[PDB]
Amino acid sequence: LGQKLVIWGTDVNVAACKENFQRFLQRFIDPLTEPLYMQRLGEINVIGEPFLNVNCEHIKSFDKNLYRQLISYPQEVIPTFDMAVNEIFFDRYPDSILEHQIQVRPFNALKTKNMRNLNPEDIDQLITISGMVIRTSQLIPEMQEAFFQCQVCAHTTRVEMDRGRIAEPSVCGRCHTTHSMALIHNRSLFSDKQMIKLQESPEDMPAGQTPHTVILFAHNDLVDKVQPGDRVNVTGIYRAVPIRVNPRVSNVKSVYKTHIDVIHYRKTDAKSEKRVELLKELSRKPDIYERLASALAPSIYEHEDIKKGILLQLFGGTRKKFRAEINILLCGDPGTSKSQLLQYVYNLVPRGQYTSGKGSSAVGLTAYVMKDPETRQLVLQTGALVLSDNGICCIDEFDKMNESTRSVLHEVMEQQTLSIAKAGIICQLNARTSVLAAANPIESQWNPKKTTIENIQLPHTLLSRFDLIFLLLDPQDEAYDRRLAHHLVALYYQSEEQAEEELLDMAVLKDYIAYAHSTIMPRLSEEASQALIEAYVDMRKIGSSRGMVSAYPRQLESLIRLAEAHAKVRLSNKVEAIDVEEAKRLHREALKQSATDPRTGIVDISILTTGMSATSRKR
Template sequence: MVIDIDQYPQQPKHNFEDFFKNYEDSPNHFKYREEIQSAALRKKFHVDVLFEDILSYDPPLAELLREAPEETLREGIEAFKDLLKFYSGGKIDEELDYFIRIKTDNNSNEVNLRKLRAAHIDKLVYIYGILIRASQIVPQITVAYFECPVCQQVTKVDQIENVLIVPKQCSNCKNKAGFIVTSKDSKFIDWQSIQIQELPEELTPGRVPYSIKGILTHDLVDKARPGDRVKITGIFKTFVNENSRGRKSTLFTPYLKILSIEGRNAEDEELNISPEDEKEFRRLAAKPNIQDLIAKSIAPSILGMEHLKMAAALSLFGGVRKEMKDGSARRGDIHILFVGDPGTGKSIHGAEKVYIGYPTQNSLQWNCEAIGDFVDNLMNKNKVSIISNDDTEILKLDKNSRFHTASIDPNTLKTKRTKILELSRHNSNNLIKITTKSGRKILTTPDHSFSTILNGRLEVLTGDQLNENSYLPVARKLDLNGFQQIDFADMSENIPEGDLVSIETIRLQNSLIESNQISKMEAYENANITHGTFKKYSEELDTLPEGDWIRTKYDTSWFPRKIELTKEFGRIIGFYLAEGNSEKTTIRITNTDEDIVNIIYEDFQKIFQKATIIKNGCILCQSTVHQWFKHNFGTGAVNKKLPFTFITTPKEFRKGILSAYFSGDGWIEEKSATVNALTKSEDLATSLLDLLASFGIFASVHVKEIKKGQYKGNHYYQITITSSELFKFANLIGFTSSKKQKDLEKFVETWVNRKHYQSNDMIPNFGTLIKDVVNDLELVGKRGSWERSFKGELRGKSQRQRVGRMYLQNKVQTLKELYDINYKKYTDELNRLEYLANSDIFWDKIATIEPVKGNFKVYDIGTTDGHFIVANGNLIVHNSQILKQCAHISPQAIYTSGKGSSAAGLTAAVVRENDAAGLSLEAGALVLADGGNAIIDEFDKMDNRDRVAIHEAMEQQTVSVAKAGIIATLRARTSIIAAANPKMGRYSIHDTPTENINLSPPILSRFDLIFVVRDEPNATFDNEMADFILDLNTTGGMVDTGTTSDPLIPGETLQKYIKYARNKFSPKLSPEARKVIKDFYVDLRKINQNDKNSAVAVVARNLEGYIRIAEAYAKMALRNVITKEDAEKARKLANKSLEDTSIDPITGKLDADRILTGISTASRQINSYLDAIKKKIDANGGKPIDEEEFITDFEFSNEIERSKIEAFLAKLKEEGAILSPTQGKIIITPDSKSKKK
């Protein structure tokens, strides 16, 4: 919407007052009036306002707010204060600061941080990013009182700049220096600076994240902490840079003056998984080898290493976080470490119509067309991009594509537009036809997803899961925001230019002849008429119609080329659809009401300057106009229609159509309290439903059969408006017929005062929402009291699970008032009830479900929110290389180096700011990746500060900071997938992991799986690797390591699949899986239990890791139960990790101490042997000792088997630690020292 400057409000305060008092987010619910009344009651000093609400109510005010937010908000705050004063009984504290917090729910208002430009300076902007740094909260002076040191005169100075403004001189004694701020009289506010950065998952690879500073004041400080994702509305501001000498630069530094901030954790992010995605996920999960397929899809450009890919995949899916009764938690995140040598690495029938928003330069041109036509057209234009999957063809639209369709917000239940992401089509010989109580119909496959309502929330069921007790959502309101409005009807659109004669052309050619600029023959040719006709018109120019009127060459009557879509033209079309027809060259509209006939006549005269009144009607004789009406609206009762483009026409025009149609073919039925209309055309009936929906009016349509008379057996369609929708019709549309309008007004006046049961517009299946709210209020009352009666009334509704919408709206308002009186915060359940009561959804019960056999082409469209609305009734249907690949595939990940990419490193840090805040807390990679994955290369290169803090981050999943007065605990619920390099370049199997990697035992012990990747010669594998790399380079990377039957999962699909699995599944151990894991752990513990000096193979921490791995295996298959097979796979992978890191090369047995302490049990024993031998040699005067005597003594004193002592001595000889200078004698080598391995 473009608004001229001269349309901006001249007195924004008055506009704000009007908005606050009169904005309705639902009928008779004055949202901001009630919020301000509540603010007055609660002594609140701010009001939260949605920008979209202002935009819908007062577009010029919204545009002014966007263009000049500071000045406009000052006016708005004055309006807020006036209303607050009014509702407070005339008293408010004028010394306090009052605010309007502008927020937005529409992501289309978002400005990408990277795209903030000079054009945005001093404009209102909305950004979404991650808070990476927050300063201390410090006081900022806004009103300063200065005391003169000479005469003690006090001077007040308002502080509007960042630099303190001091009086130039004392007004009393003229002193000019030494003024002292008196803090007790001055006014201070809270102030905090933050740094917001682009979301890591939205960052293009290779680009440095863009960030911007933001300023928080008053009650906004401390609203979010580092690591939180934040939605911010603010003003894009700048300040001038100065050098050390105070010289000002021409370059300015940008910042955000924040008006509102909302912190959101990663776990609160919307899932955005469509029903079609879910269907695909279920299909994938049903594959018996789904876990292997996912692992192969992680890094298809790497040959082999399947266990590494599987470990990475398991970390991406994660286990289940468990909250303990004592308040502690057990992490579900799986930590993986790779240590490697260098160089190792649904559908609906095609005839069903949908709303399609085609992109234009600045808006969308909406159309209603068959889904099959839309999908086929785009697929035919993009054949090379079609993906074939079995018998299904899929076309993923480019990310810059701007095709939209109508949808529903699953959270607020409001209609909206949504972006189309992909299209699909396939053949089916099995469909079902669903018909609802209101007469809506849809033809779909049995497995297509539908949203229904269960426990007050949208739930997804497939068509074959629905039954006659199910409810389907119907959009009661059609709001196609951002459309390009059609303001004129072009009567010449189907006429060849060579057949047109124009009055304007004749006038122009005549003037050119008179000024001798062209010849008469040229003028006749340009005017497209003969010499005689031109001469006749030239003589009668004053009698011809003014403006751009035309006719065809073969006709003599004129008509306007373009007709403005006014109420009058709408009435003509409405009466034509109800009671008109086209015959030869004439449009005929019949009606016995003389007043209506006169209205039709006057409208014809105003637009076409001709018409004739006949008995019981009016006619217009004009061949071309007749053809235009016949083409656009049909003729004959059965063939009448209404172009969908009329839904994007001016409101008054649409009102004219409906008002006239219902005046012609409509009536009021007092007994049933309905307004009705009839038509024989099914197309027209559904189009009228759409047109009513554009006013937010819901109507039903039912097929009726004529029982007697000459038309017996024929069918017609009855449109019915009932209940609260009837009042909307009376207020927004009404009848053109004065008689029917009076009857309607009289009926509404009497009906509104009656108590009547609402039987049509019901909210079903709301679960325990009402019960929970009533229980939370703890209403107590004696028998017969209002409270007791109120509770009983609501309890009955809760048991029946059906409640009228108007009834629920009233009760929600009462409940909110009770919460306000008791100073209680509205619960999620109450908010959900309010969403249901004020939603844009009519819950339509299914009447019949019928199977339909045949050969059909069926289609689907995938959208950003998983839903789209079927038109003609508005039914809503629910539609290192491994590390880098993990970062790409993870729904939320940060890829970084152990060295860190910022001062905060991997955990967090206190950094010094240049501004008054002094010190700030900055989040590191593990905090910024909260709720996702931290992919860390060169993990062994982290600095010492991170080495200390990372123990807490990996186990307790928090990062604590206590430095320079800043004490904070930040969330770090992050899975780590890390890679490290051996200290000496190559990994030595004789050394422990600690000796190989520059990481301490406590850090290593927190990894669930550690794998060693060694570069060892292998002729077979080397040949395969060579061919694989050559193929990669030859085919440009298009090597598919999946099989023909199981192709690899595309990265985008896998990313969604992971997000879905992480959010939807919390697997628990089955008895069989429990036994496998328990036996595995116990068996490992038993390995050396008969030898008190032997190593412990595993510890309890390993057991917790095995459970997490098994949980991740189950998640990969979208299961909530861990099967025996999952546990077996977890055991196998854990064994591989143990083999890589925990087998002692001396004993060949598992030894947990190699990781837990960095020293193997065998190494400690070797040291004890060397010490014992040294003591014996020292006692023998430094001479060699008898080997047999030593074995006997050591066996007796240490209770160790003789064979083990002999084996250790043989190992010491092999390593050169001891020598046998003569047979049966041993001595320590001169340079031998105790070894710790």
């Protein structure tokens, strides 16, 4: 009987606790009006989730003693609260159906302890701690009901798990043969379980100390909700269990291993027609192209055409070998704005990636095969170019990638695939990634006596695959320096209003790009076709002088990509002469910056081969 039940050696009455929690559910209307948690139990009826999250601050404000009993004795109290919630969910809404009994999930919003100060006095208390997940194990199947069958006579029985053990039948009731009941593993019933290793956050550490870690266990319906690298305030019971000295011996070490029996996660670092009509109205705004290009990278100064090219890359061409991915190269001295621009723009798009061209990159450009450490089996770890299969890949310090990386990147940029024949695996992974690059000069400074390919020492076989190449060196003008200094002073005086304006611009920019990807598919108009043919023929007519080649058809395909991207920027859905002229302008400016021989200006052969005519005529 409920009224006779009392927590063991505790004098807390279970029925009183249940009724007090029901009173909390009934009366708590005031988080700052129906009760908040009865509103949530109205929502759960249609949402269908099997849990009710509740705030321990709310419980404490309603009743100090109930909160204290929850914190002190969660192992008994939380099942009591579950029974209370499942009674209320059929007192109200009595005709409802739900596949599982509701699980209450108490939590304090902030940490009650930090993991360095956990003590044995905290054992079996409800606590919550802040941390970062280091590793997350495979889904462990944990038994909850053992199904036994008689080997002789096929009689079956079911027995509950007591405290992890099984009360094996020892004799079959329907034929009385001893030791004849056999556990049928796949007829038994299992719940989900997973181990999570949690490290304290870096700011919480003492000065120069290595991290402490704690083990978490998350069970059914709360199992796979966290990933490595994320941050969480995790609420659970601080358990202490014995560990056996040897797997074949039941002696246990005197020192108990501890872990967190997880009850609630709260991720702390992860974060419509109105949106559609706002974006549609914004697409008709005058100079929307310049508006979006200026919204790109507010911290960076004056680089208009670079931002415009990055915008056209982020919008991309029309998908349908018909590669629509626009390739962009940034080129300039170390310490300049290109690295900051890459580190900004990679998080501005879904499916994006950022990596270094050097061997210290966390995720390499090439796919490889490794032994997964937690299980020591082979796993095909694909590279960043493959993980960014429909997004931008930001390759910083592009220039100094080794020859194998150069070859596989050439393969990716030309074929939009990455072939691997490593360890018996033979497969051709898709990589429709938009390569955005940042390349330094080989020496410490840019050399105006030399063109881009000779300064950066990259092959023409890679440089000719890029749609646009831009120079990020700064002028030596005192007006430029003074304007840059005023801009940097404004960045120093950046305040909350500028931050909110920049974040509003960032949000609408992300939404605009995603919507344009989702719905816009530009297609050629007749004037677009005539303009593109005219552009290619005109830029080929320059070759009448000196008998040189001044263009090649991949330039035309690049212009098609850029025009389609510009049409997608303004949500036209049909590409026409306005887009084609902007594509021509930006493309010609990129060639003017990149393909300029110092002796004669722009010359197209610099991209086709290294060593332009003014250099090669030494021999």
